[PDB]
Amino acid sequence: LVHGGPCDKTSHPYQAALYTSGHLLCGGVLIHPLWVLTAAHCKKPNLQVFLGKHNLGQQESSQEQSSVVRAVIHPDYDAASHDQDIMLLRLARPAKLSELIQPLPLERDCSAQTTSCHILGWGKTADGDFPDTIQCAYIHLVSREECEHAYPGQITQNMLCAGDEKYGKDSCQGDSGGPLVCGDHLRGLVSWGNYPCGSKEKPGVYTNVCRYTNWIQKTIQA
Numbered sequence: 001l002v003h004g005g006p007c008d009k010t011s012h013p014y015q016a017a018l019y020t021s022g023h024l025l026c027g028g029v030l031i032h033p034l035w036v037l038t039a040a041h042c043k044k045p046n047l048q049v050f051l052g053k054h055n056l057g058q059q060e061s062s063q064e065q066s067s068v069v070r071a072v073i074h075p076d077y078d079a080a081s082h083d084q085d086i087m088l089l090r091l092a093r094p095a096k097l098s099e100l101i102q103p104l105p106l107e108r109d110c111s112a113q114t115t116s117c118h119i120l121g122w123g124k125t126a127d128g129d130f131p132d133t134i135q136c137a138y139i140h141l142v143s144r145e146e147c148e149h150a151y152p153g154q155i156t157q158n159m160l161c162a163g164d165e166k167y168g169k170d171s172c173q174g175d176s177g178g179p180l181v182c183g184d185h186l187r188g189l190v191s192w193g194n195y196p197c198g199s200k201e202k203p204g205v206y207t208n209v210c211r212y213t214n215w216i217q218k219t220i221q222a
């Protein structure tokens with residue numbers, strides 16, 4: 001996350017860290033003791049999910065670990081266009097809940113007009129380095145028209161755009177699958193965006209979670 005700052009250790013209990021080959025690949029969202037919601041482009045071999053983490057460089061008393069039993073990619077995910085970029089991860093071991101491990105409620109209502117959001121993760125910071133401490137930033141939901149102009153013919157109804165014209169607060173490499181939180185509900189998933197990271201002109205693109213209400217439930221019920 002570029003142009004943000006360290007999160008408060010207690011303000012992100014739903015945050016997941018996804019590892020592959022000994023390094024952080026993506027973020028994720030705990031939405032159920034058995035399920036982490038992430039981006040479909042985060043599918044990599046032998047994913048290890050870490051819950052209750054704040055500082056990646058140190059073993060913490062609150063952290064929990066789990067292998068993936070089943071990675072469920074949306075049937076209509078299109079890798080070339082990033083459309084329907086959502087994946088459900090079934091945890092091998094259900095998450096042991098505490099004050100630092102809790103699921104985030106999803107936004108079911110597509111009509112919701114809360115523009116004031118926040119992003120978080122352990123992705124590349126302004127200096128081009130990967131932080132050990134989780135980063136936060138307040139960003140705003142950009143218009144469909146503004147996004148459509150920034151990325152011609154690449155924005156679908158399954159995508160949301162959020163940024164900050166003021167300082168260019170954006171998600172970055174390593175923040176993918178992570179949350180876009182609006183009104184203490186999951187509004188989006190870090191999907192893709194401008195390179196180098198920065199939303200001063202071209203906003204960050206997020207999977208639009210409200211559209212997947214039915215598929216999520218149907219997957220968890222299976």
Ligand SMILES: N=C(N)c1ccc([C@@H]2Cc3ccccc3B(O)O2)cc1
Pocket residue numbers: 025026027041042123170171172173174175176177190191192193194195196197198203204205
């Ligand atoms: N809004 C942006 N500027 C933005 C955010 C996240 C990404 C990557 C995409 C990715 C690809 C492959 C593996 C992981 C990721 B991810 O963590 O972030 C790229 C751009």
